[PDB]
Amino acid sequence: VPSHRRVNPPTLRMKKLNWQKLPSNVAREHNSMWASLSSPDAEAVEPDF
């Protein structure tokens, strides 16, 4: 379930945080943390956008 990807668009312009983006197939492996975080039963913390 793509809970973290469901981000509303904001109306203003934002400073871009720099990192190195992982590939989607690498993050969605069975023993990665990101697939376990992709579960709907995971504790989704909502940030104040």
Binding site: R13, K15, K16, N18
Partner: protein, 371 residues
């Protein structure tokens, strides 16, 4: 719209408006923090003095250099340096003026990432540019080709450029420049009984180095002349009124540039660095680099460095072709002058880095754009 040229060197930040000949704001890059206790309440006792204020009140200030060996180590200090050079020195809004900047060769990429992120998030500009210091020095020399020995305060790097192509493999770097000469001058002044241990005293010894030191044309003859006669002794007045007199230390201190075994480095002098840079080039283009030995940086301000440099290369290189040293009088600011040349060009409008390019491609388009 006038651009801004601001060489953020290791030694002194040199900034001013583009299209001009001289930088308006030359000031050393130090952040001074008070080490003692304040008792006098009021009158704007600000906790971190930057630039000329830190130079003037330096007797109660621990001084820190944000740029060490050509690498921006402390970042908040460098942000304070940029804030002082934009808001207090030039007194211009960054959001309405392009800002040219300079950089050392073989730099880390994340350094360029961080400088791009500061120049687009904190100090917002319409456009900016990062260039190699040797390339701008060659541009201010008026020649497209040549080899540049740029010796600043931390880095002495050799860069050969042929027809605008800066050869990457032939670039080398020697970590021996003006601050190391100042530390060695602190070490050898204790033989005469003068002690300089604090960072405030480093500016005094640096001023001694700037005012009195000179490159010997022959080292052993200057040893023989100094040991024989006391004619080359020169006196200097300290800020407290005391007068010292120095002898051979006027030319033992720049001789570290030719003999790094004084401070204990296995590498040879800048001549061997230049020569080994020359053999890394193609054999067709070596002839042009011999006649185009350009210097920049204030560590080349000693008034015996050109003839000694020509002697050292002519000893090193074969004597079949011509050796020539390009040493202009304004090669201290030739980085800034080359930036002012490059900023006001009609072609240079299409190599600017816009905010739209920043928003599309992160702080990472500087790698694929610039060399």
């Amino acid at each position: 719209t006038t651009a801004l040229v601001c060489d953020n060197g290791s030694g002194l930040v040199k900034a001013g408006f583009a299209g001009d000949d001289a930088p308006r704001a030359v000031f050393p890059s130090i952040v001074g923090r008070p080490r003692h206790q304040g008792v006098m309440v009021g009158m704007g006792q600000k906790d971190s003095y930057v630039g000329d204020e830190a130079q003037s009140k330096r007797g109660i200030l621990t001084l820190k250099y944000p740029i060490e060996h050509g690498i921006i180590t402390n970042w908040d200090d460098m942000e304070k340096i940029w804030h002082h050079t934009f808001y207090n020195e030039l007194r211009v809004a960054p959001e309405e003026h392009p800002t040219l900047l300079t950089e050392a060769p073989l730099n880390p990429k994340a350094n360029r990432e961080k400088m791009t992120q500061i120049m687009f998030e904190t100090f917002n500009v319409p456009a900016m540019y990062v260039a190699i210091q040797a390339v701008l020095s060659l541009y201010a020399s008026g020649r497209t080709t040549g080899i540049v020995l740029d010796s600043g305060d931390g880095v002495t790097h050799n860069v050969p450029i042929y027809e605008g192509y800066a050869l990457p493999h032939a670039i080398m770097r020697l970590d021996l420049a003006g601050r190391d000469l100042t530390d060695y001058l602190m070490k050898i002044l204790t033989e005469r009984g003068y002690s300089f241990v604090t960072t405030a005293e480093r500016e005094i010894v640096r001023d001694i180095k700037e005012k009195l030191c000179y490159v010997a044309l022959d080292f052993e003859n200057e040893m023989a002349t100094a040991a024989s006669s006391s004619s080359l002794e020169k006196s200097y007045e300290l800020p407290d009124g005391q007068v010292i007199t120095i002898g051979n230390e006027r030319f033992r201190c720049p001789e570290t540039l030719f003999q790094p075994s004084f401070i204990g480095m296995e590498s040879a002098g800048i001549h061997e660095t230049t020569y080994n840079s020359i053999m890394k080039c193609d054999i067709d283009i070596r002839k042009d680099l011999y006649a185009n030995n350009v210097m920049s940086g204030g560590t080349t301000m000693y008034p015996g460095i050109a003839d000694r440099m020509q002697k050292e290369i002519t000893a090193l290189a074969p004597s079949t072709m011509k050796i020539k040293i390009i040493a202009p009088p304004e090669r201290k600011y030739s980085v800034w002058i080359g930036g002012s040349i490059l900023a006001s060009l009609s072609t240079f409008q299409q190599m600017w880095i816009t905010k739209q390019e920043y928003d599309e491609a992160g702080p990472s388009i500087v790698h694929r754009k610039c060399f």
